[PDB]
Every structure is written in C-alpha cells, then in structure tokens.
Amino acid sequence: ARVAVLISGTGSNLQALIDSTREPNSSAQIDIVISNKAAVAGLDKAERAGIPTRVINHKLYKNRVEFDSAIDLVLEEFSIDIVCLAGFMRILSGPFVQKWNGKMLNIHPSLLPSFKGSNAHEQALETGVTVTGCTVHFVAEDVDAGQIILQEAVPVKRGDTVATLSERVKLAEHKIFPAALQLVASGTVQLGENGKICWV
Numbered sequence: 001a002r003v004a005v006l007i008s009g010t011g012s013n014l015q016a017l018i019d020s021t022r023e024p025n026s027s028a029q030i031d032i033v034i035s036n037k038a039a040v041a042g043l044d045k046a047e048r049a050g051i052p053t054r055v056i057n058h059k060l061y062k063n064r065v066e067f068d069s070a071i072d073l074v075l076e077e078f079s080i081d082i083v084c085l086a087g088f089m090r091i092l093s094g095p096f097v098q099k100w101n102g103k104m105l106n107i108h109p110s111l112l113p114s115f116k117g118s119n120a121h122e123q124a125l126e127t128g129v130t131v132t133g134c135t136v137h138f139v140a141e142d143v144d145a146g147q148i149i150l151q152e153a154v155p156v157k158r159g160d161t162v163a164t165l166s167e168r169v170k171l172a173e174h175k176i177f178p179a180a181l182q183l184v185a186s187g188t189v190q191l192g193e194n195g196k197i198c199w200v
C-alpha cells in the first residue's frame with residue numbers, strides 16, 4: 001500500500017512509521033510526506049529518509065475544501081492508498097474525509113472516547129485519571145469518533161505534566177501506529193460494510 005503521512009510538527013510518529021515501513025515484511029511504503037507548516041522538523045526527518053516532501057500552507061487557501069482539495073491533488077499525484085495523520089493539526093473537510101473513508105488513519109493521545117480534541121493531555125491531567133493512553137482510529141467525519149483500530153494504555157504518574165505524560169504516551173504511539181498501519185496495509189483490518197471495523 002502506498003502511504004502518505006501528513007504532519008504539522010516534530011515528526012516522531014512519522015519517524016516511527018518510517019522505521020517500521022523499512023522492515024522487510026512491511027506491507028506499507030511511505031511515498032510522500034505533506035506538512036501544512038514550513039521549517040517543521042518532520043520535514044527534515046522525511047528528507048533525511050529520502051522521502052519526498054510537500055508543504056501545503058492552509059493560509060494561501062480561502063476555505064478548507066480548497067485547502068484539502070490541494071492535498072488530495074498531491075495524494076492523487078503520488079497514487080496514494082492510505083493517508084496517515086501523524087501530528088497533523090488541521091480538521092479535514094467532509095468530502096475529503098468521505099472520499100478517504102476507510103483509508104485514513106489518525107493517532108490521538110488519549111484512550112478515546114475520553115479527551116477528544118487538541119489538548120488531550122491537559123484534559124487527562126485536569127481530570128485526574130491514573131491511566132491514559134493513545135488511539136489509532138479511522139478518520140470519520142466527526143472528530144476522534146471514527147472506528148478504533150488500536151489502543152495502548154499508559155500510566156499517569158504522580159506529578160506528571162504535559163511534558164512528561166506526553167513523553168511517556170509517545171512511546172506507546174510509536175508502537176501502535178506502525179502496527180495499525182501494518183494491519184490496514186495488509187488488508188487484515190478494514191472498515192466493514194456495516195461501518196464498524198472488520199478483521200480478516
């Protein structure tokens with residue numbers, strides 16, 4: 001499966017995905033890396049990897065659909081099969097999500113359905129859980145409520161902050177995201193006709 005990875009920042013999940021898709025048995029190949037922000041470090045991790053990069057600045061675009069349409073165009077150009085949102089911090093338009101229904105994965109740093117949205121760690125700390133984690137799911141139209149592919153639990157330690165909790169969670173992210181991609185690329189997992197997640 002040809003895979004595109006969209007980023008907005010450091011790219012540690014990108015780097016974990018790169019590492020795993022270079023494995024002999026990997027059913028995925030990363031063919032393009034797209035970032036909506038320039039001079040972000042994921043772009044360099046990808047350039048060091050030999051992977052093409054494109055920056056699509058969501059500012060030059062009047063509306064969202066014109067912006068996503070810009071991305072779609074690149075996906076088509078690279079004959080992409082699977083889209084991986086790895087720290088991509090834009091919300092995708094309905095038609096874009098519908099078009100890539102069943103083919104777009106997202107990594108979120110909570111145990112969904114807990115702590116949706118952009119500050120999951122702050123929410124987890126504010127709430128006082130002693131267990132959090134991360135979730136790889138299919139992107140559906142309503143955010144962080146598509147079909148769940150993998151989750152891993154991560155303990156919250158006394159005195160944790162966003163810095164230390166997110167450090168510990170990212171170690172889980174870098175495991176279940178490559179695994180989730182491999183499940184979907186190998187055809188072992190798919191969105192079923194019934195909309196829930198289908199194992200094979």
Ligand SMILES: Nc1nc2sc(CCCc3ccc(C(=O)N[C@@H](CCC(=O)O)C(=O)O)s3)cc2c(=O)[nH]1
Nearest residue numbers: 088089090091092106117118139140141142143144
């Ligand atoms: N349809 C759809 N689009 C998706 S995109 C992502 C990737 C998950 C990332 C995010 C989660 C919440 C965010 C948010 O509230 N974002 C603001 C802030 C903008 C910024 O620049 O930080 C905004 O974009 O307006 S972003 C997942 C999903 C999804 O499940 N369904």
Ligand SMILES: NCC(=O)N[C@@H]1O[C@H](COP(=O)([O-])[O-])[C@@H](O)[C@H]1O
Nearest residue numbers: 009010011012013014087107108109
């Ligand atoms: N709502 C989505 C979200 O919060 N995404 C989060 O951004 C980070 C990106 O790190 P990286 O750029 O080093 O992969 C990850 O921790 C991921 O869970």
Ligand code: NA
Nearest residue numbers: 106107108144
């Ligand atoms: Na998310």
